[model samples]
Target: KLDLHQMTTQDLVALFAKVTVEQDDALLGNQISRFNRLFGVMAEIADELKARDGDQRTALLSLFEYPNMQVRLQAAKLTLAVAPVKAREQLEAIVSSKWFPQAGDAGMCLDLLDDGTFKPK
Candidate 1:
């Protein structure tokens, strides 16, 4: 696991896609561990970006278009704080489609985002 504290925006953008989890709907051993680590680092990075005033968020924003279904969904979840409109669009599509197994969770995320109470941190 790369240290999230040491990675640059480029590194994070690339790293996130590699480790993001697609809802397998179960908690396997390595799978669960990897999921925790990935989301833990993501949350830290989101908090870091939130406290900054640069274009760091832009790097993550592009991940909303990542080829991997899981990565794009994770990116949308993290980027929601900085780019609500685009994130909402992603969230909406996620819930409306059956492409990802987590569509129901995506719908719940959209509901929370819609209610203005979802925080990346």
Candidate 2:
């Protein structure tokens, strides 16, 4: 076993991605939670990535490709929160993706946003 305590951020992420791909879901979940925690330790690290900034928030929306619907939904929420009007294109595609069974619901939300919807306070 590797000494995770001495692991660098890159080491942890690589190990975590490996575990995630190995279908060791139990351990993967734990390590992913730990990764999220560690990411939060610094200011604007993950949050400032291209995935979380400006029109490039598209990188995060691509998380939907993983079949994690919850993550996809969260990406939608975050996109609108950051660049509400600008995300319409990607957000529309997300709703159109196979991940959403009833894209109708998300479509309505995105449509609302297209018109007069207010961004979060």
Candidate 3:
């Protein structure tokens, strides 16, 4: 029920952080519905940022270093359009780190990116 359009840049960033945490928890708990719902919100946030100034979207790039693996993964995925090299590097680092689930997801993302199946924009 949150209004993404009415949110400020900081608000969006905070929401992104909150949602990423929730999504990770949901995944751990096997809560598919909750995870998917938060996934949609994250997409909305990404889209909203993409429609605004570049700096607003680039703000998410900072999350690439977030402590939560899921947060880093999602941030890298969403910010790929804004910072491809850094995003890809982060994803690669995740894969190299050998973290389960997130690392597997990161590998898939790289595969899709390499095959041109998933265009960031």
Tens-digit lDDT track for model 2 on 1-121? Answer: 2233444444433433343333333334666665454334321322434332243344444444445444444445555655566446555766767544425546777767667755541
Off by over 4 Å in 3: none
- Model 3 Cα displacement at 56 (Å)? 2.7
Candidate 2: which pairs clash?
Answer: none
After TM-score superposition, what is the CA distance of residue 119 in candidate 2 from its true location, in Å?
2.9
**Comparing 1 and 3 by lDDT, which wins?**
3
Cα lDDT over the full model 2: 0.46
lDDT of 3 by residue, 1-121 (tens): 4468888888898889899999999999999999999999998898788788654779898788778999999999887888999999999999999999999999999999999967977
How far out, in Å, is residue 36 in model 3? 0.9
- Scored against the true structure, residue 4 in model 1 reaches a CA lDDT of 58
lDDT of each prediction vs. the true structure?
0.66, 0.46, 0.89
Worst 10 residues of 1 by lDDT: 21-30
Evaluate residue 69 in candidate 1 and report its C-alpha lDDT on the 0 to 100 scale: 67
- Please, what are the lDDT tens digits per residue for candidate 1 over residues 1-121? 3345566767766665565643232233447765666677666666555556563665687776667666677778777766778887998888777775557668888777668766654
**Where is model 1 more than 4 Å wrong at Cα?**
1-5, 21-30, 117-121
Ranking by lDDT: 3, 1, 2
